[PDB]
Amino acid sequence: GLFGGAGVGKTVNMMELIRNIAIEHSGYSVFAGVGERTREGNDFYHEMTDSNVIDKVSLVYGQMNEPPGNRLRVALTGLTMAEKFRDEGRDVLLFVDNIYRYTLAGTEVSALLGRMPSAVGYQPTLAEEMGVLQERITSTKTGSITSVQAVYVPADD
Amino acid sequence: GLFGGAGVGKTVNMMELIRNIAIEHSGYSVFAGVGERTREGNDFYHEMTDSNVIDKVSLVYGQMNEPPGNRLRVALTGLTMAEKFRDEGRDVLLFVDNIYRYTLAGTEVSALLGRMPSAVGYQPTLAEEMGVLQERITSTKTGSITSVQAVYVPADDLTDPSPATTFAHLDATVVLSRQIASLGIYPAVDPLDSTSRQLDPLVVGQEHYDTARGVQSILQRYQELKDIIAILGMDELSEEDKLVVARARKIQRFLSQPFFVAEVFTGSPGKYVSLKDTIRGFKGIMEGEYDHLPEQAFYMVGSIEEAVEKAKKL
Amino acid sequence: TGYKAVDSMIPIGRGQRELIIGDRQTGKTALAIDAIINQRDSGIKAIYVAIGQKASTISNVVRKLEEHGALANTIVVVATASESAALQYLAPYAGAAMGEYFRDRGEDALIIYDDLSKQAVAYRQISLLLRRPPGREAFPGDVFYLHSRLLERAARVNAEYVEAFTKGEVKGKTGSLTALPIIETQAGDVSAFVPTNVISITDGQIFLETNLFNAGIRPAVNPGISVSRVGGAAQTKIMKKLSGGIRTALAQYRELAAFSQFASDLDDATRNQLDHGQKVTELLKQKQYAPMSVAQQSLVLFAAERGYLADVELSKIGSFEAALLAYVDRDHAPLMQEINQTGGYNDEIEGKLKGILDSFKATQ
Amino acid sequence: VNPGISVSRVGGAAQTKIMKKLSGGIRTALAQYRELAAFSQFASDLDDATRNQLDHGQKVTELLKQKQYAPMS
Amino acid sequence: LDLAKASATDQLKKAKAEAQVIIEQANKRRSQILDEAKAEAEQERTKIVAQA
Amino acid sequence: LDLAKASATDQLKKAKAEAQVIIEQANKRRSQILDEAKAEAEQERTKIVAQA
Amino acid sequence: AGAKDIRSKIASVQNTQKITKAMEMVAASKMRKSQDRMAASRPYAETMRKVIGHLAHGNLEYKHPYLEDRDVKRVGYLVVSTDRGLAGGLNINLFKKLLAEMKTWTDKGVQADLAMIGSKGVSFFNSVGGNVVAQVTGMGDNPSLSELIGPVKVMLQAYDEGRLDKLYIVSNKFINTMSQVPTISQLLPLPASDDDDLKHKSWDYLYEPDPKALLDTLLRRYVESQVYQGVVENLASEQAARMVAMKAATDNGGSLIKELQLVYNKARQASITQELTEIVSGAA
């Protein structure tokens, strides 16, 4: 869990992670995001040049207007990816964007079901999806299945 | 708009409303009863007759027993009739009350209609009715129609779209309240929120405009003081507070006023009260000028002098 | 925007949507009205929308429209008390239609939507009318998508609008779309799933305090309860420069406030925190109708910059003698040409700021 | 944990002459060092009553804590 | 003493009157400015509602 | 010397003081007028544009 | 709670009643030590008057300097004032009656001269205005005659100088433990004790000096230790009603606890109510 406000050099330190997870660590350093600001995402392509090391991680993005399934989709294919990296032994360590997008995302999900959803209509099993989640991320046999844990603050609940 | 449920003096306040109404009446107008106490209509009507007043004014009469179909029924009669008058009499004017009867009727109807009641039961779309009619009314080129009305405040439920939705259509909001009743003021109502949209500090000047702003403050002033005064008693206060609460009991009381119609409800008639004086004494207690007159003399006060005539005697 | 503080709290730029909570019968429509001062003055591309509208408010409103110098600087179609719950939902959809002919024009598109609840319970009496189980308040939860699709559009000027307008006959160019939110509720209730999720989407959130204009202070709003993300980045170098101390008295004054909590607790230092806090509090105001000069930006930077912290410290002399400094502009306001021209921090000016304060001695 | 706010049906019912008998006076005395501490701050000068109690109960109170992975003989 | 307080006195009050005059210059100066403003404004208005 | 000096400074001071006091008062008058005048011009434009 | 409020709140009312209960206790021990201590200061002043007469029968045949106290220009005055809080309202009782007496001197119209002791009425008569040639303040609980010295010969001038004919002397006291005596005196009277000045000193006391000196300074001693006693009793009153008010404030919050009992209890019922409401509604 990552709690901190601003001025992180999170992109800087990410370059230290390039300088680490890519460099000072070998294990395949992947990351992904969703729900950003358009040209500010393009400015994270600018930053992608700042680190320049963007080559470690495919660029796959949500752009939050993406519908709820669209918004909530990318992960398990992400496991078709660590199905390389960790599975590739080059330990999958992939940076993890957005919980509020994911928390609220599963909310909009079980809502759309009209089902008895989780409390306050959230995704009932979203937590079980966390059991599947950490269930995915382990220093593995294959390669350490690792993830940068930082949350779109589910309203910083 | 006239808020308050009935029992609030929504009508009994509306009594003096008929007094000074008459005072200013001087127009071509008509009115009618709805969901009303019967003999109220009987002898009240017999006051119109007593006033010989029914001349310009025909009255349908609804009673508390009425049919809902009757209740909401008299509406379209209002429609066609106004079509007659406001056009015809370019003077058209009326007053009314207790519509929460009608609106409510629509609510019950919704599910009764098998229609989805609105959320928590109203006529599902009933606001459509609301701004439909509030729409449907105008002081017209056809003719200017001055009018006013009440509805039962839903046991004074504000979020009640009766009150909630109501805040929309009305130009100036009113409340017949237990507050000045809790205050025991001759009014027995809650103004403090009421907005006169016509009050422009240009228009008002700062006579009325300024005096008013001082009200907003002093309101917040003694209002605020309520807190810690409650806490420790009021001892901890700087005395200036006591100046505020001073003009609060005093001047606030002074607002409470003789009004001629009081004679009925309050066996004694009070006094018509002119506004220039209101600016005057407004200065006086604003000055705390007298400062001697009891809040009592101020309570139910006549004018500044009348309350100052008090201040001599009282 | 018509308050000096308008900019001062949170400047911005094209592409942005900030919520401002609002107050019933407080002006927060009439305050909300009081906004457009600089906008009609802006004579720049904007839009606004209304549903279920009131013909009186319509009429007198128009009266202001002519009163508003521009009245043509932007257009609005009108939807009244009969505008369909459908149509209610429709206007937000509607704006983009030719709004492109600015945004696509690469011009700033800009819009204003209000009474969005009308679109919501519009979808409610729709949904119950649809006999369709909606979200709470009988309206479907589409507001997410409804304001996903709806809320998406705002596009700050950017040239991967390379097809915007002429496509791109350049027009290779920067589609600017600045969004104008309207946030109000009875009590301003965020528990609305609308106010919840919608609240999230906000690129700024301003709480309006009924308190100031309630006790009457003409500008009423709730600061810091008002929080907008765009901020004084758009405050130009001086506006950038001088804009700092705000939350300070929001602290300090209010911090000074805390001292009262113990009857007779104060300190001369804290007394200075009610001198700046409370007296500098006495400084600020914005009217029922307030324009803002932004050459007034200087007017701001005075109190610290000039001795106006002390100078004419009397609110009598603050309002009065300060207005008499507006005189000193009448006396001397030659360079303000080059100033509002400039709009940026340069000490070279700041000399003229001190000697300005001398004219303020002359201006009392 | 909450001190006797945790309330077991069984308790010293199973406790022995040392345990039941010898070990008795706990929780109320606890409430003491608690309650004895209680007034101390606002109204002050707790005598060696509370000192010699609250602290004695604060001292013994200190002797209470048993870390994770601590069984007790 | 005499020399000092004297000079200070005279220069002081002289300075005083000068100042007062200055205030007057600014007074009907900016004030007259106000009047003229009134006039021009008037013109603009007549124009406006004429246009109406 | 001493009492003299005292009165001299004190005086020329005070004289300056009332002097400016008046000056500001008058200036306030020129303002007051030019205000009233401004109001008048307003009234004029009003009527003109109107019957126009 | 209540909803989020009435209980967080009402609990704050618990912190309240509790807090001010600890106040009742604190200000109680305060009261006990306050009078208990407050009783001490009589002994040598008592002696002073006693003997003062005792000789002063035969001895009184000589001269009285202060028989006028100060000469008549002012009828003087004296102020003591609060170094602390929670005691009571002798700001109102004493400061009220004080302002009153002032009006009586205006009625007289003769001059009057006051001196602040204590902080508060230093700030009353500061605020309320007046003439305090000396201002003393806030010695705390410790009456000290030597502390009084600077004040002692502060006043001793004008009085000795004959400036302030009579004077005004105001001292709180605990009239009972319950009853608290705010007192105010016409000071700079000739205190005029002729009592044991009835019986010619029957033990003919060889007097190393002449009397009138000891009249001045020793008199200062008598009235002074008198002052230590009187202000002490002012402290008796002080911490007494301190404990009192402390208790009552400890009381107030209960009613609130009742109301919040109606928001958490009544709005408890209400929460239950909506629970039923949308329980049904979403439950359809």
Ligand SMILES: Nc1ncnc2c1ncn2[C@@H]1O[C@H](COP(=O)(O)OP(=O)(O)OP(=O)(O)O)[C@@H](O)[C@H]1O
């Ligand atoms: N900045 C302001 N200072 C003082 N009064 C203001 C201000 N803005 C608007 N008002 C006042 O508000 C009144 C109109 O109230 P209005 O109905 O606009 O309140 P409201 O706050 O808009 O309610 P809502 O926002 O729900 O419509 C006008 O009389 C106007 O003077």
Ligand SMILES: Nc1ncnc2c1ncn2[C@@H]1O[C@H](COP(=O)(O)OP(=O)(O)O)[C@@H](O)[C@H]1O
């Ligand atoms: N101005 C007033 N003076 C005295 N009593 C009033 C006034 N206004 C309202 N009331 C009180 O309100 C009570 C209810 O009368 P009614 O008009 O039937 O209330 P409502 O209209 O709310 O039913 C009356 O008994 C009356 O005493």
